[PDB]
DNA sequence: TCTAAAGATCG
DNA sequence: ACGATCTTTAG
C-alpha cells in the first residue's frame with residue numbers, strides 16, 4: 088500500500104482494498120476528484136486522467152512530475168527544526184499567498200500541508216490559504232512518496248477542472264472512479280451530488296464503467312439507485328456504487 | 333465542529 | 344444612516 092505525500096481530507100487509503108475489489112479493469116483510469124491520489128497510487132492502469140477543482144493541487148502535481156529532483160531538494164529545506172514555529176509558519180503562509188511563482192508556491196504548499204492545523208486545506212474568497220499553525224512534534228518529509236508519485240505520474244495527465252468536464256474525457260477504454268466530497272449526514276451541493284450520478288448513468292449507457300464512493304445514507308442510496316450498491320462496514324457505513332455496462 | 337469580529341444584505 | 348440577520352474570516 089503506497090502512501091500519498093499529502094495529508095488530505097476524505098482520503099481513501101483505509102478503503103483501498105474494497106475499492107480495488109470492485110473497480111473494473113481498463114486501459115485508462117479517470118479520477119474527477121483525485122485529491123491526494125491514493126487510488127491512483129495503488130492501482131495499475133496503463134494510463135491516468137486525474138482532475139481536481141483545486142488549482143494549487145494540480146499545479147503542485149505538474150511541478151513534482153516535470154521538475155522532480157529540483158522540487159525535492161527545495162522542499163526538503165523547509166522540513167528542518169527551524170521551521171516548526173508559529174511565527175515562521177505564518178510568514179511562509181503569507182509568502183505562498185503573495186507568490187506568483189508556480190514552483191515556489193508548490194514548495195510552500197507541501198510545507199503548509201504538513202505543518203498546518205490538522206493537514207487542512209482552507210481558503211478565503213480571495214483565494215488565500217488561511218489554515219493556522221499545526222503545532223506538530225516533528226513533521227515528516229515524504230521524500231520516498233514524492234519520488235514514487237513522480238514515477239507513476241509519467242503515465243498521467245493532470246487537469247484543473249470540475250467533475251463534469253473531466254468525466255467528458257472518458258472514452259470506451261476508460262474506467263471512472265469518483266470520490267466526491269462526503270454527502271451530509273444532517274462547497275459541493277446536493278444538486279452536484281445528484282448531477283454526478285446523472286453523469287455516471289450517461290457514461291455507463293455508453294459502455295463506460297463508473298465507480299462512486301460515498302457515505303451510506305438514504306440520500307446516497309437514492310442518488311445511486313441505478314447502480315449495484317455495496318456496503319462497506321466501517322455510526323455510518325461507506326457505500327460503493329458500481330455502474331457496470 | 334468551534335466562535336468573536338468584520339463584512340454583506342435587505343427593507 | 345439604521346436595524347436585524349446572515350455570511351465570512353481565521354485562530
Ligand SMILES: Nc1ncnc2c1ncn2[C@@H]1O[C@H](CSCC[C@H](N)C(=O)O)[C@@H](O)[C@H]1O
Pocket residue numbers: 095096097098099100119120121122123124125126138139140141248249250251266267268275
Ligand atoms: N466540483 C468539483 N469538481 C471536481 N473536483 C472537486 C469538486 N469539488 C471538490 N472537488 C475535489 O474533490 C476532492 C474530494 S476528496 C477525495 C480525495 C481522493 N479520493 C484521495 O484519495 O485523496 C477534493 O480534493 C476537492 O478538491
